[PDB]
Design a protein around this ligand. Structure first.
Ligand SMILES: [Cl-]
Ligand SMILES: [Cl-]
Ligand SMILES: [Cl-]
Ligand SMILES: [Cl-]
Ligand SMILES: [Mn+2]
Ligand SMILES: [Mn+2]
Ligand SMILES: [Mn+2]
Ligand SMILES: [Mn+2]
Ligand SMILES: [Mn+2]
Ligand SMILES: [Mn+2]
Ligand SMILES: [Mn+2]
Ligand SMILES: [Mn+2]
Lengths: 440, 440, 440, 440
């Protein structure tokens, strides 16, 4: 599954529909990024630029011009064909091929942007620009507007109104099309296969980074070349560090390992966490904490639906956690009083859910305390966890246990669809999976 | 094999030995780099900063103070211990532990750099600073010097002389210690195992990116988490693109695939290229071009030694290439006249060799036209290639063939050591390797 | 005559009336400007900031908040009272006194602007800001908006719409109140007295700069401390240079001197040009050119009125000039054909008129080719000139003559009022004035 | 008196003598400075640039190249001849005329600086540059060095050492040539005539700014067009503000007026302060304070000589002040104890002396607490003062009195020459001067 030319075009048109007559929207590509000296990191297109183009080159700018309420057109600035540059560094789309390939009306060389952009903005009332997104982009836009402001003797005029299109565009991204959901479903499947593989491969004495290697190989074979974020493989005490990415330790017989990893497939993020015993068998202490996190996730998956909110579901999870921690003697006191005191926070210190899409921590307004009412088309994670620090003042057997279990869901008309349930999470299923692998 | 605390210390001392009395050298860490929105690329420390510290954190600055010809000391600025930041994002070395861990005299919080740096520079004659390396670093240094310049009423004075330490440090990096060579030897071995794996796994119908996946998994299992540069897997016509990294095509029965990939092991780069038939058997045309590139590499490996140069060895390769291309009818005319006209350049348009080390295209002065005389301790690649474009005016059977074969070598007292000869390159050996794999 | 607190307040209210509900307008003071090393030029407040405050301090920002269609208020950021800074550098208004003195609702310390500005913008829909006017201002505004954009977890929101208030404010400035016209009338009177003085003082052998000295002294004694622009005193060939400010030459018996000088009185510019003989008597050649420039000015003064334009009146002047130059043999051919060819342009190469106000070349839209229809309340100059270069291919006697004659006018309901007719311009009146002075 | 071409040349040569072989020094002109909108302040050349050129244009850069110990040459970048730009804005020196006019070897267009500067720096070991002096200059220099650093394949190399030439050049400026002293002597004479005029013109009811007008007119008539700093005319309580420049009050019968004003003559500053009664007669209270400041100045003028210091002479002044203030009951206690407590500081809170030259607060190292030993050729001010605030806890009659008396001196082989003694300062001489003027 992918996003096609006609969908990118529909998105451009939907933005144009929201724009004032006599305006232009400017969407800039990501800069290339140095890794060291003259070597660059693998290119990652800006999510918003990608959303409207599916075009994976730097030095590109999409300009949507809404001349009035019926007439609009698009102009792409992009790198020129250049035989020597292409022999060295790769093929370029160029100007001749872009209109047909991308479904834009006109294409111009990026090298000419300063000579041309002001001409496109001249006489417009409004420019939509994400000020501060990129320095290079602000320079180009500010230069164009200055030429227009200072150009009255050449009959030039600048648009006086600049509107940040990020809020409008991020609200578009928050609600996924069926095609987007299909892509996210595939990302979830790929990511789940990777996690299953990690559980089947994990043995005491392997290094945390070995599981990262297994996961990334699995992503790759299904055509998700890159992870959507830096893979976390936190064994033992390392699991208590939320974004542990050192992945440098030897995994010990008797420790849990917490894996938070997700692929990037056609631009879209998977995002799964599974925690499991390195040796294939939960200890009693590990199981006692695990059961509370799993109940939290299972209850959340029952509850998430249109008309509730992340805040409302979080309240249910907090009750589950406080209740469970009191039963184990990790917290002491009356459950309702402890809830009132947010007594869970030393052990569950992050949010239950974030939006998911072209960014793993995806764009879109959450509302105060993530109270926004959920609607069909929203995609989000569900990621309860409990982290008991090595020096926590709790019964000894729980110290140094970090557990998180995370699925990706889409809100539907009656509830939700779990995109990542194809990798096991019930403790008996984890143990059976690992037992079977360990016998081979 | 690795580089240890005492070696990092020896390097700092060797720099101090080269510094003027009454001076300070400032070496800054790399910034963290955005991949998309709030996600960052995996951190890569600045090579020069790494060379003197082995410290893999951002927000760090090494200050070497040479008070006079006998007295010197070191100060590290680095991130403070912070329980909440560490729970979220990972452990920090902090100030208490740094002197012992890194072998520096003092450690101070990076948050205090603007309050402290000017005090360390006050009254010195010379500051060594790599101006323009990083914007954030220039801001810090320029601010410190301004405070000193403007501080005469507070009895402050700025060093009037600023010296770029890059030339001195890059000349240090150009000559590897035995420990560095051991690390590079291991990088070469790891990288060679990865290339052997790619040849053994390659089958028609696999995608170029699948071989990338095999290679990166192999790097990872030996503890080289990341490649030293973006992997190139160019099959068919894609092999004619020097830094082809799209790796997006289905590999065809009858095409060659050119793989240029290298690991990063303890900071140091491997860098191997092998080209081989996708179906395990070179065609006659493919073999005819391959033989010329291989002879070029083999002759270069015989020749490279102290007292010759990249330029001198390149002349021998050019003769081999022109001679071979005339024999096949790709070039026409007298060999010596064609050499005089650089007639090989449409087909071999890049350099034979680059330095290798903490950067894949490593630092160090080459001399005019890479004429610098070679000495023991230099490490370099040997990477002849021939690329016959799909539209070249040559006998048809050669069109769309791109072949490069690259090894990594170290110059020794009598010649060179090949660090990457453990992956085959003779065509009969490539075919035997692939035949054996294809029968499994 | 001056502009008073209540008028500054009316202007602020008139801007607020034009603003969208749920918005804030930000108007920043001018930076102080270095002359050399640690010495600064005399402070000149930003015209727009002045227009809304009458406040002559740097490090000040006026914030007009329109909460909704009935509720609005003003906040001034300005320098705090500071006993030591004031002993050294001058008194400051401070926060306690500002509301009463300036008629603003609240005053806050400029040192707190970054801690406070984002709080004032939070939750607004629109911010009015003159982007690019000052770097320091853009930094402050961009920082505030970034804090808001990134502050969703603190329940902060940024206004998505930024509107340049310059067009609205400059249209306000283009139409003068009666009080403004009174101030401009006084500026015109002061400037005219200065020009009369220069004619009465001028003698052969004096330097051009001596007349500058006379003029500036005259400005000063009437309470116009500073000129509104750099005084031009161009004698002989120097008169052919439009903005000649070197003023370095000895004025020669037989040359004309062209003086373009104007005071700045309560922020408002006078702008007069008079040209006259250094020795008090026009030569025939000088008079022949002078008569054409004077007829051009006199006809323009008859014509300027509501309903015509600078472009229309310029056409009449061009005819006068071409006709006169043909009569003298400076141009050759048919007058209407020469007009069609813009044959006057080598000799009259600038505009007839510019707006006049808080800037000498005042703000406001002219329309294409200065075609905007004139209306009561506009204030403008009328400045025909003819400049015959020393090497012009014209009858010899005219070479090196530069003449400009300029008055300041206000458009009224039936025509115009000349603000600067109290300094003579008829050649017989100039000669009588100078003869009388030369006899003393 | 002036500074001539051959002296500017001698200075360039003296700098070259101090430079390392294989180096270039870069000295940049001042930017033009906006006053308001499209009007600029009168141009003031950068003092250091002026010191080496006597060239009063912007967009100019002096490059001194010391190829080795015997061979050196100079290159000026400056604005090209341009007929239209010159007709509009003034004559330009251009490239053809510059070598002869300024005594430089070569001149190139400023528009070509980025194409040419790197070529001049290529292969040098050292560049002398005043980093941070001007943003535009840093941009040009940093760009040149980057091209060289990145240009190894074009056989380019950057100088690795950058030296701030300000310390060397400012030490040159600290010691005046006889020609410089002649110019400063004339500045002192002009400035003294201006102060005498102010005393002769001052009457109760005039505004502070009227005396500014008299002073500036006097500067102008002697060919010092501009003041060297913003004129201070502080009457009554305003005299207690050290750099009072509002000059806005009506001068009252019974108040003193303190005038601190100085001309700029051929680039060099005069700097005189005189305080005198507005009505021509000191009151007893005024005279009592005045006598202490005058004794302080007179004693300083006796003492200043080679081999003493500003710090040493300041100690003598402090004793005079404390002794006098005890006698009047303004201070109470033992003189030596009060001196030990710096009890004078509420009333004399600034330094006695600053260097004087191309800047009024001139360049040059003072040493700790201005302890540097004086030598012939140094030029400095002597400016004791006493300021008794309106709310000081002192006998009532002294409240609101601010007195400063300042002369400019040059250190000579036996003592000093007073450059400004031609304007009276003894109270009986001030009164006689004013009485005589008031009778006219
Ligand atoms: Cl391009
Ligand atoms: Cl820190
Ligand atoms: Cl403040
Ligand atoms: Cl130029
Ligand atoms: Mn997540
Ligand atoms: Mn996750
Ligand atoms: Mn290589
Ligand atoms: Mn390679
Ligand atoms: Mn004018
Ligand atoms: Mn004018
Ligand atoms: Mn002074
Ligand atoms: Mn002074």
């Amino acid at each position: 599954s992918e996003i096609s030319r006609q969908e990118f075009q529909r998105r451009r048109q939907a933005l144009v529909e929201q724009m004032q007559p006599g305006s232009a929207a400017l969407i800039f590509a990501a800069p290339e990024v140095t890794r060291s000296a003259d070597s660059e990191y693998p290119y990652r297109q800006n999510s918003d630029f990608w959303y409207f183009t599916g075009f994976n080159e730097p030095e590109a700018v999409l300009v949507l011009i809404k001349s009035d309420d019926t007439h609009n057109h698009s102009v792409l600035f992009n790198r020129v064909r250049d035989l020597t540059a292409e022999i060295w560094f790769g093929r370029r789309l160029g100007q001749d091929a872009a209109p047909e390939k991308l479904g834009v009306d006109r294409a111009l060389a990026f090298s000419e942007i300063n000579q041309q952009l002001y001409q496109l903005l001249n006489g417009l009332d409004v420019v939509y620009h994400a000020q501060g997104e990129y320095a290079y982009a602000d320079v180009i836009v500010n230069s164009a507007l200055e030429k227009l402001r200072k150009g009255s003797r050449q009959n030039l005029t600048a648009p006086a109104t600049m509107i940040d299109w990020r809020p409008v565009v991020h609200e578009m991204r928050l609600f996924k099309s069926p095609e987007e959901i299909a892509v996210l479903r595939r990302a979830g499947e790929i990511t789940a296969m990777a996690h299953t593989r990690a559980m089947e491969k994990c043995r005491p004495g392997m290094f945390e980074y070995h599981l990262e290697g297994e996961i990334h190989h699995e992503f790759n074979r299904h055509g998700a070349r890159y992870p959507s974020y830096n893979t976390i493989v936190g064994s033992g005490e390392n699991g208590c560090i939320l974004h542990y990415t050192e992945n440098e330790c030897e995994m010990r017989d008797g420790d849990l390992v917490l894996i938070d990893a997700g692929c990037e497939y056609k631009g879209y993020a998977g995002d799964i966490t599974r925690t499991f015993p390195v040796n294939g068998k939960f200890t009693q202490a590990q199981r006692e904490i695990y059961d509370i996190v799993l109940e939290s996730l299972e209850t959340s998956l029952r509850l998430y639906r249109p008309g509730t909110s992340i805040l409302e579901v979080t309240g249910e999870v907090v009750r589950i956690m406080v209740s469970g921690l009191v039963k184990l003697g990790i917290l002491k006191g009356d459950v309702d009083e402890l809830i009132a005191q947010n007594a869970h926070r030393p052990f569950f210190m992050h949010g239950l859910s974030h939006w998911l899409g072209l960014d793993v921590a995806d764009v879109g307004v959450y509302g105060q305390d993530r109270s926004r009412i959920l609607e069909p088309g929203m995609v989000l994670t569900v990621e309860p966890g409990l982290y008991i620090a090595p020096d926590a003042e709790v019964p000894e057997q729980y110290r140094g246990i970090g557990i998180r279990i995370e699925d990706d869901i889409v809100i539907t008309e009656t509830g939700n669809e779990n995109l990542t349930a194809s990798v096991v999470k019930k403790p008996e299923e984890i143990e059976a999976l690992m037992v079977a692998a360990r016998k081979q």
